[PDB]
């Protein structure tokens, strides 16, 4: 069974024979958002669950109900706060030295890189990776200007995890892009299931 999304983007089950005409199946991915390092582990796990459900041998009716239930559970758990902090991390690699970036203000990872260079010990250079998490500061700036280090959250008090960003820009796009070729699921339905406001994504006509 194969789900082909776009160019260089497909998930599939590979048939591995064992003996006497018996064969097992192994899940493989190529190009999806689940294999990249610039997405949170939460979105990758939810997308992996959705891929596993879609490619199964069950009827098309049951998979939609299972996805709905699991998405509702994720929506409740994210606001409840039962998911550990380590699953909210986004990892990005640096190409040039942190001091050399002219657009330092608008990029989160370089903003964290200058901090970790300026106060910490080991200095991050070109080729190294930086982990950042988007949190609530209360200064009313944009999301890309509110990046903080993983150790900057458990030490200070005024910062808290921004659930809106991770629930409307991290989880929703992945599951919306995955379920595009399948019917019965749409962006507004996922928005309602996750507990978001449908007004932003598509809606419009009354």
């Amino acid at each position: 069974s194969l789900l082909l999304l776009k160019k260089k983007k497909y998930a599939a089950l590979v048939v591995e024979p064992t003996s006497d005409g018996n064969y097992v199946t192994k899940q493989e991915l190529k190009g999806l958002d689940i294999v990249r390092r610039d997405w949170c582990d939460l979105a990758k796990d939810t997308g992996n669950f959705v891929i596993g459900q879609i490619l199964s041998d069950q009827s098309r009716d049951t998979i939609v109900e299972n996805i709905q239930k699991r998405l509702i559970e994720i929506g409740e758990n994210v606001l409840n706060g039962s998911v550990p902090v380590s699953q909210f991390e986004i990892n990005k690699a640096l190409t040039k030295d942190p001091q050399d970036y002219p657009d330092k203000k608008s990029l989160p990872h370089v903003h964290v890189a200058l901090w970790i260079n300026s106060q910490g010990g080991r200095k991050v250079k070109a080729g190294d990776t930086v982990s950042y998490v988007i949190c609530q500061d209360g200064s009313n700036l944009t999301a890309s200007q509110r990046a903080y280090a993983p150790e900057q959250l458990q030490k200070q008090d005024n910062l808290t995890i921004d659930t809106q960003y991770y629930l409307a820009q991290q989880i929703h796009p992945v599951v919306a892009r995955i379920c595009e070729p399948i019917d019965g699921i749409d962006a507004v339905l996922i928005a309602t299931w996750l507990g978001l406001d449908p007004t932003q994504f598509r809606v419009h006509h009354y």
């Binding site: 309602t192 299931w193 406001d197 007004t199």
Partner: protein
Amino acid sequence: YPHCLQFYLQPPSENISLIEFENLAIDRVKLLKSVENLGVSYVKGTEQYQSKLESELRKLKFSYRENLEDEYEPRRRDHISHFILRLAYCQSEELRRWFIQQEMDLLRFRFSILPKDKIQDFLKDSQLQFEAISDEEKTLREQEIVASSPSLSGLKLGFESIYKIPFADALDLFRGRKVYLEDGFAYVPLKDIVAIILNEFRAKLSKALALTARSLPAVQSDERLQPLLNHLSHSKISLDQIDLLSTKSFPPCMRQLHKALRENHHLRHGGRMQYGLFLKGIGLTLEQALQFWKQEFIKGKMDPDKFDKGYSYNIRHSFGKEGKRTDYTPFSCLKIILSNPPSQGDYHGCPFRHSDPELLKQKLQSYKISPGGISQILDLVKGTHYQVACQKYFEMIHNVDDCGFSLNHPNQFFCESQRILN
């Protein structure tokens, strides 16, 4: 049964006519809007506030003081009204807080008017499990309670009753060492019980609102309820007459664009550019243009942050305040006719050209155009003579034999129309 204040649970099961369905929603909206005015213009303790709010509650047939038995009708009215209004104000997060704040204020008012002695039964009628203490018990613990009292001045233990509550429900109080705790039971004055009642009501109200929003797509399937769920937040040169100009001076294209903006609360890019440049042409400045666009987009149930970071840049650039700082001329009618043909979901373009006669006929009809003029305009359109047809439209809607000018620009249309109208 105490129909003068009620925690809203157990949704009803009666059936009603649709006219009453809309009337209840509009009456509840009116009352809840006036609560805003009363709470803003006055302060929470004046007699005038109480008098005005109770007079308005009397006006709209809503429940108040319990001393006159069978007001079953106001009870039913309020019970249905709250649940019918729950569906509308649960969509956007800017409306849920607005609903909760004013409903809590209304419940505070309704609580303050209970006479003195029907409060006890009510507390049991809302699943709260509270208790009172007799006079001998009050005298036994008088010194202990007055010592445990908050910064409330005086040792005089007045006639205000002292209530007995499970300790876990008084978290906001015993945390600050402001009450008396004995055998796992907290003793509170009557003044502070309002805070805990409202705080416990708020959580249940928010939970009910959330659980209704996610199971609300199933209710949109009904075609008779669409207007209600989407139009309860609907509704030299100034802002408060543009609509009138839409009927009077605008050409059919720009009138169509204004109607689209009024109805759908959104527009595509071509219509945005065209209408914005024309609206600059008539004489608006930057401040009221931003006011107009943001007011027309907030009614689309989007918060101001999205508008500010999405469309404000383009709106400002249209007037020439960013970039090369170049001020633009409104689109000439030729480019409206020939450039950027419209598609599905778009309302821009010239109606006399892009719209088929099978639609242009009723487009003229809806604008009180005479059938002879309709036939003449259709004949002109069939002959690919658009500008003279638009001129004939101007003459017919202006009741003149000849306009006296050659039309090539909608701003010229508007200026010529205003020359004679004003």
